[PDB]
From TrEMBL, chain D:
Protein name per its UniProtKB record: 40S ribosomal protein S24
UniProt similarity note: Belongs to the eukaryotic ribosomal protein eS24 family.
PANTHER family: 40S RIBOSOMAL PROTEIN S24
Basic residues bias locations: 99-117
Start and end residues of each stretch annotated as Disordered: 88-126
Source organism of this protein record: Oryctolagus cuniculus
Biased composition (Basic and acidic residues): 88-98
HAMAP family: Ribosomal_eS24
Any one Gene Ontology cellular component term annotated for this protein: cytosolic small ribosomal subunit
One of the GO biological process terms: translation
Length: 141, 57, 185, 126
RNA sequence: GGGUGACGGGGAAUCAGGGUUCGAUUCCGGAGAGGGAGCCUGAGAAACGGCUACCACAUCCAAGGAAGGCAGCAGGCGCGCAAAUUACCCACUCCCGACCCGGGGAGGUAGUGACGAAAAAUAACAAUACAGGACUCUUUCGAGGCCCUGUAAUUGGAAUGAGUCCACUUUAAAUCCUUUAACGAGGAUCCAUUGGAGGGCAAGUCUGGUGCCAGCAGCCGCGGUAAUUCCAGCUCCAAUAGCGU
């Protein structure tokens, strides 16, 4: 069982150090891997240019097209399928326009019906999508 | 597959309705007073198998 | 580099289980009894009490006849007596743990206004205090949370420079007097 | 008439050549007395004119029947134009200052670094 | 030996007891002034708002030459999810000088500032019409009112700051607060918001629309013509100058 003895400190402390890496969450945060893989290079959000409006099909038990946006990030050059939330909101997003993208709440894990969607559109052309949906602000022209 | 066509279908053809008028509602302490008064003093009746603060038959 | 403090703290703790129901109901009751503005006003008192209890526990963990305990505990008791929460004779530290929110609310200004006649309902009392109508001792205490020292309770009354406390009448009565003078008369 | 005044924490500064103290003004129902009135009242109290009395730092309390602030009485004006801040003299116009305005001085002196010796040029500058 | 999304520490954030994480960042210590190197002066420098080279960037040239270093303070570009005014002053705190007198983007003062923290308004009272229930009275119905709560009529005048604004104070000069005159409330006004309302989890089996669509849904799920879950209206709930992601 346990090492327990009085002059063990090192043994104990080393073994715990060894085992910490089988704690999945620890390894995520201490190996680079995820920070390399995250298109938001350790960031809450990322601006990025929209390069096509793309319908995602929902996963089996729920049938619905999702209306995503293929984004290309500014900082990295990586690409993304951000989910454009709320009803008829896709129509606000026209091509080549500067969207802010956030996480979808799950920190890498995709969410609910959508296959392969970590990201959701927050702002469109420096306005905020919620505000457009409400009918508060308007798309500049 | 599947078109990006119907995009804002239901938001579109919903029947628009005016948002009515009523009153400048009470705020701050006054609101909290009012809500205290409508749990603890006004009603406090003889029970009839539990309550419902937004009940409707 | 500057002058400047940067020494601050929150006066309250937010509750963990945010919809306990019985917790919500209790806190509402506390807002009713003492016409408080908001829930956080309850919570700041809950927090102040909690600190005190935390000190009491710590002092109890120490040995009796240890100078650290004897000094601090006596000082904590004297502080609580001063605000009229704990009674002289009841001062011996184990009684601090048996204490409650209700006692601390009771010794606000908003209470001792309403308690000493003066107001006419607690919501009236809170308004008065805000509107610079009451004075503690000599100062016009604008603020309801002002915890009234037991010492300085009997010196609560109306502000001298005011309508209620014997002075120049407020602008509404002045306007109605002008209307009766020039308009009607 | 109905103001009343007190003098708290009075000190005899033999070696700055002054009396100096905390003026503590009662003034209920009125709008914080101006300094001229406070000086004149101090003059009749201490029997030593308003000229040598310099008063400042008045802060009214909450409610508003009491202000508090520092004041001092020099022996003569000759002394009070020697151990006294220039602003506080200019407060009642007896040692005014130049209107060069800092920034212009700096720009003038930053030119002059540019040129050597020529007193007329260094007088000119800007 | 390699790595570090590594300047060290004081400390910060969570926390029962243990811990876990953070510490570029106002105090102390270090290191550096685009990159490397070399040195003069000097008590003290391997100085960079000192010089000499090279590299890399760049500026006038009459093309022979000459000058350059904001990780000072403002400000710009750029990078980006991500950050303030080319403001006023040496009055305080200190420093420097030969100096009681000069100088200080050290420093202070305003401006921007929902980083965050404290306090804290958005109504209070009255009789009315009433609508109810502990008491007294009454078989019940009804009544006497110390007690009271909801909705109305704003019915009633009273109280008030937000605000507008003389004056003082403040201050280096101002501002701001404070003090204070004069104007300054019937809510149609001086309008509280952000998120919810199947479960977890506080709160509608309400009504209208759509019909596995549009959409919601952190998770479980809801949607295929009676949707408690979608878009709306109504009501309700939570926190409240905040609350969501
Ligand atoms: Mg590194
Ligand atoms: Mg340092
Ligand atoms: Mg160096
Ligand atoms: Mg640089
Ligand atoms: Mg060097
Ligand atoms: Mg420089
Ligand atoms: Mg910011
Ligand atoms: Mg500075
Ligand atoms: Mg706050
Ligand atoms: Mg308002
Ligand atoms: Mg729920």
């Amino acid at each position: 069982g346990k090492c327990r003895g009085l002059r063990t400190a090192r043994k104990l402390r080393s073994h715990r150090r060894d085992q910490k890496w089988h704690d999945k969450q620890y390894k995520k945060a201490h190996l680079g891997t995820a920070l390399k893989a995250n298109p938001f290079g350790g960031a809450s959000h990322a601006k990025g240019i929209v390069l096509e409006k793309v319908g995602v099909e929902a996963k089996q038990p729920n049938s619905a097209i999702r209306k995503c946006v293929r984004v290309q990030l500014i900082k990295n050059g990586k690409k993304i399928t951000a989910f454009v939330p709320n009803d008829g909101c896709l129509n606000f997003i026209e091509e080549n326009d500067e969207v802010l993208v956030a996480g979808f709440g799950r920190k890498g894990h995709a969410v609910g019906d959508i296959p392969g969607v970590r990201f959701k559109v927050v702002k469109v052309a420096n306005v905020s999508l919620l505000a457009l949906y409400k009918g508060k602000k308007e798309r500049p022209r | 597959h599947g078109s990006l066509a119907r995009v804002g279908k239901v938001r579109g053809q919903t029947l628009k309705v005016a948002k009515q008028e009523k009153k400048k509602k009470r705020t701050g302490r006054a609101k909290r007073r009012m809500q205290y008064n409508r749990r603890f003093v006004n009603v406090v009746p003889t029970f009839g198998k539990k309550k419902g603060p937004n009940a409707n038959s | 580099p500057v002058a400047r403090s940067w020494v601050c703290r929150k006066t309250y703790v937010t509750p963990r289980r945010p919809f306990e129901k019985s917790r919500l109901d209790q806190e509402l009751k506390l807002i009713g009894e003492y016409g408080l503005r908001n829930k956080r006003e309850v919570w700041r008192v809950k927090f102040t009490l909690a600190k005190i209890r935390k000190a009491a526990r710590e002092l109890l963990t120490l040995d009796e006849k240890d100078p650290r305990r004897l000094f601090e505990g006596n000082a904590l008791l004297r502080r609580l007596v001063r605000i009229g929460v704990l009674d002289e004779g009841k001062m011996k530290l184990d009684y601090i743990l048996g204490l409650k929110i209700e006692d601390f609310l009771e010794r606000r200004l908003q209470t001792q206004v309403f308690k000493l006649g003066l107001a006419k309902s607690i919501h009236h009392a809170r308004v008065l205090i805000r509107q610079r109508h009451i004075r503690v001792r000599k100062q016009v205490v604008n603020i309801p949370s002002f915890i009234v020292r037991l010492d300085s309770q009997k010196h609560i009354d109306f502000s001298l420079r005011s309508p209620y406390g014997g002075g120049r009448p407020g602008r509404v009565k002045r306007k109605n007097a002008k209307k009766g003078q020039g308009g009607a008369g | 008439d109905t103001v009343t005044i007190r003098t708290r924490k009075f000190m005899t500064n033999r070696l700055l050549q002054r009396k100096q103290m905390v003026i503590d003004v009662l003034h209920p129902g009125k709008a914080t007395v101006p300094k001229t009135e406070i000086r004149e009242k101090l003059a009749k109290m201490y029997k030593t004119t308003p000229d040598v009395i310099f008063v400042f730092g008045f802060r009214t309390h909450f409610g508003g029947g009491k202000t508090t602030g520092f004041g001092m009485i020099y022996d003569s004006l000759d002394y009070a134009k020697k151990n006294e801040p220039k602003h506080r003299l200019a407060r009642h116009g007896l040692y005014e200052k130049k209107k060069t305005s800092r920034k212009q001085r700096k720009e003038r002196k930053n030119r002059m670094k540019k040129v050597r010796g020529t007193a007329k040029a260094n007088v000119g500058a800007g």
